[model samples]
Target: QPAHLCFRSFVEALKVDNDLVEINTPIDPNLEAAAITRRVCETNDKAPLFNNLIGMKNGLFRILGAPGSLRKSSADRYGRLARHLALPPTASMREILDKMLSASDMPPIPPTIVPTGPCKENSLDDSEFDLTELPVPLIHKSDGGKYIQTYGMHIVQSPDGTWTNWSIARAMVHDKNHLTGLVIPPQHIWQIHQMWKKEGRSDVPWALAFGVPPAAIMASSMPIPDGVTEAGYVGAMTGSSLELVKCDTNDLYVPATSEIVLEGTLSISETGPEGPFGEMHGYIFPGDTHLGAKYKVNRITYRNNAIMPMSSCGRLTDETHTMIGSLAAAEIRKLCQQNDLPITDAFAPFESQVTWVALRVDTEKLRAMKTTSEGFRKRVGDVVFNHKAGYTIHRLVLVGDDIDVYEGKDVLWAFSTRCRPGMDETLFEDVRGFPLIPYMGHGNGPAHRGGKVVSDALMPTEYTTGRNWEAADFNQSYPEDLKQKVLDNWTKMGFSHHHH
Candidate 1:
């Protein structure tokens, strides 16, 4: 069957499956809408679709919160993400990883450009492009201002038109026609902006698209390698090229099925006061306003019933920590495998707030190499620390194949029991980190920088040519026949089979 790849189709599927919850009561955009979303993310509740936003005309726009939040049911915790990838709701982590990895071998198909799209159904030029009219929510009380660009995808291209980057960055409304947000160095957006700077160009033409296809949104959050365009990768993911349409004022292209599109130019020579908003790391830096990149919106276009998806950026299991964080892990896994490393799997547990990357090692390979615990730990640290995407990751825990990287409980168990107090961890000092990380500023370290740890959470002998240890878990503790008998009668014994 062909994949349902548009934003509307995905949400319709969720609603049809009873996974989406709609609120018809008028909700205040100031905090009520965001508070509901935050609560839903924390409680593993349904995705909230608000039909009655305060101060907005009915049927003109809507808000979708916790767009890809995880499901609470034990049967399908990855339900939201799985549906985005065209997998069954009950798909396991390994199954999801395998599906993502399969795209690595597939050829990327470029987007197909069209003359017009639904996003152009309504249009506003510079005179009518007013951000104040939109029902943008103030996500948190501590936020600097109302943000409308949390989940939207920014489209920018290199001066040579050889590379186009699609990424998600937070943007707070600064005025009726202006937005302030980050354009940090080392990211694709900033890198392209630098190329323009070298050519003496101060502003970069750009377009921001909202309510794109689920797969497209996921691809935008991925930390793919430099020079790689998200379009091809997205095509690989969905088995088809994304439908694109030319922006009204810019040379850039945007998703044809996008609910709304904002055409603008990102000023590199100028900056504006922004921030003090909550970040994905689950913290709001007090008094954090600083000069940021300014986006001057020149044009706005939208469909008749445009929907805007917002991610409440705080705490665990939000879209930031789940969708982007999980995708980063898949990229790390692919990177390790490309380097011929013995990593069996890699995952960033949600509880870590998207910081710790746990890699399950292939113990057999390490044993064959006669490796030592310290040597393996150092090697892993060096490999990951030198990579681009790994800079955002603060900790790496290496475990045996017996541990599932996605299972936080198993990861913690291996960490607490197998890891040595200090000797098993390799630390690196004076490493640059993403500024929003709490420890990067207040921890016992230098400002805007911190140390990272690579902990050896495996038995020392697992690398000494062979494993001389055994796990004390149920499967390993019982005989094969006994385990089979227990599993066969598990349901008959009145035990829930969904506990896994």
Candidate 2:
């Protein structure tokens, strides 16, 4: 069953027939699954795994629909975030956040190196097969090209081989053997690419891993510091060593269990116009903009009956932004704490991933810290807006400790009531922004600098220190007996399983 495997592993494990839902008869993943997966996320429904992807053999291009989503079962739902951190399947959100930030303070546990794993089982090198022959779903109509690396992690190391970086960047198949996409600006991959150029070695070694350990993907998502090994942090996150094997073409070691591994070297001399892609920001670039850069793919390898999972990127909560971006929000919160800020919690609520970040501050402790409104806002802005993760987070909302920033509606409510556009909002100058964000590279801004907005949602320190504001709620003050009686009888009270 699914007990021993990660989410993607379960797709290949299922022995039963994949229940088919048809928009048109004889439906398939390329023609149907992407649209279906989008609806499932938007409607909060069950994830659908597509076994038969159109335009290819039955076993290729399996869609592990919504692999990052939490199921309705209480046992599964409560620990979803924690599972991303590689904790026991039972870890809670608070536990997940605590362990992730705690890793920074503790020494990193490096990966356990091994010779090989399932990833190398059915290796194909030297033109045994071409990637175009496989069934890769064309996700959006406006997409610039057929994307192949939506749910995969790219492995690139520094030229000196001292530092390695693992990250989730989308890539598209440009031909039978090549792929191209973004390497975050100033990211280790791009930095390493530059080094390769300077040394007259134009080809940068690279590996892209598919169907990796779910936790491994989560570790890849976080913007850990430059030169810090992700495999080490993933080992610590899982409370055990991450077993990895070296790539045949590069010095990089990928998780041994990955179903598919694309081994190649990126070409520094090549350049191509890319993307009118369906970005995480809810906009598709027009023909006037093929702003996304393209990368060359050199070789492909895989295990027997390998399954490829592609995320159809667009809007909020897709694999690229939600799975990776949401974890980034948590990591940024940890970054703020390292700066000696009294921020208690944070989230880049899925709806506003990269754009809006909500911070919950310990006000009473802030009063003890003797901090001011202006000092707090600027500090919050400066710390996040200048860092690696900061490129995406522009709007900041600071709330009181009692508020849970993960709740989207609560954040919206706070924004509506507490923010004063000019006084509460502090915009930063010359802070770099990701071009994936539509407005960043194309705008009529003051020479490519993007503005950041910081909104202090907490009742001004001047007011909270004195007589307090009352919070409205039924759950907070209700008698225990009454609340317990209602909860105990919730089933007979006609509540559905969906209510949870």
Candidate 3:
């Protein structure tokens, strides 16, 4: 956890398995790369590190697609949320949720400013800029062009240049001189972009940083306060100040050891049809979809031999699956505590793909609070939906202390046995939702135009008061000694060994 390995180290780890596939053939960046990575991620195959992408300039770029799609031990996954925080790899969903909540209370230790770092290894200006020549992968079948940067954190400053925002969004290459994308205005970067526009500025200086510190990336994806610097919290989480180096062309500081840094300006007077890229929502929305129009690119810069990390926009377990969901679950847990609710844990299981989040609350704690049913229900929903992170979360599942909300199978069991569809679900209409969500685009209505719901999946007050039941599984309530003996002798009994 304490600088166990560097970005180059992870790349070397993959090569140790010589038989692993390494594609040397040139390929298109748009849909072609996406299709290949989708199959690779879906089948749990070796990670495809594209060294020779078609149209790539001789010394412009290389792509490390699907950095963490592998389901190996947390130690192996670069920037794994659980492993980065010093938590156990096999930690239950609730344990991971609780650790994230505790992290919310950590003091913000702003980054340590230092002299030049590796990000300055190479230099380039507007004349040498060529994003199209880079192996920017056009991941989905319907993407507009080759998306050069999707997982990297974008940096922008508030009007006063006091609050710096870092976030993950998609950007595509239109030509050697143009890179267009959205910062999800109204969100962190969006708010800052608006501030810059209000000042009548034609352009806002921006930077897209890749191969940043793992802690920094996770914190960037978190929904902490807008003005609160993410590097500070990341320092607290990693038990060290995030070492930052000044951008070559801007005063902004990024991870000192960042593998690649793109220095540019986002135009306030531009518009473009940006998407059709595979989104985390597991669906692709078609029909002339465009958000912000014609955002301009000023320049691009990177270290020599930098490894660009990419994700194939597809199915579950992509960045949206592992990265976003992990952060959302952790953020929800913190939100519950901030409101003084009785919730002890929460998680957005992979099954929902960011559409819904489930809370694991302590029923006894609720009973002690003298909370009425309406009071409890309202508190749970409001705490999640009214905050910054809630804009992306629409559905809430409330489970009891006895239930394991981390496991979809277990959570589903609780819902099946405890919830009545019509009686338990409460819907909120026309709440602001994530526009990139495929359902909201297709038949689900336009983004925020959709509906939200909270279903009480916990045992009803009646059942907890005095209900009786028997679990339908052998391990449900087996004797402790017998269960331990079986586990200890399973491999000796000819079953597979651990991790087999």
Task: Estimate the TM-score of every prediction.
Answer: 0.95, 0.87, 0.89
Clashing residue pairs found in predicted model 3: 29-137, 29-138, 30-138, 109-232, 185-190, 270-293, 271-293, 271-294, 272-293, 272-294
In order, how many clashes per candidate?
0, 2, 10
Clashes of 1: 0
By TM-score, the best candidate is 1
- Tell me the TM-score of model 1: 0.95
- Per-residue lDDT tens digits for candidate 2, residues 1-500, read 13122434544332221222222234454536678777765554555656556655524545556655544455445343444444664555556666665666667778888998877777766566677777776677767777777788888877787777788887877777777787557566677677777998558888899988766777677777777887777667556777788888767788787878888877777766566677777777566434344455555556666667666667655565555556667777888888988777887777675477888876776777676677888888889988876667778899886678878788988888777778877778768766556666566664246667788886775324731655566676677799889889988979954423
Q: Show the lowest summed lDDT stretch of 10 residues, model 1.
A: 1-10
Residue-pair clash count for candidate 2: 2
Q: lDDT value for candidate 2?
A: 0.68
Clashing pairs in 1: none
Tens digits of per-residue lDDT for model 1 on 344-389?
A: 8999987788888899999888778777877877777777777767
All models: lDDT?
A: 0.84, 0.68, 0.68
**Candidate order (TM-score):** 1, 3, 2
Off by over 4 Å in 3: 1-6, 10-32, 72-103, 444-446, 462-468, 477-496
Name the lDDT value of residue 158 in candidate 3. 75
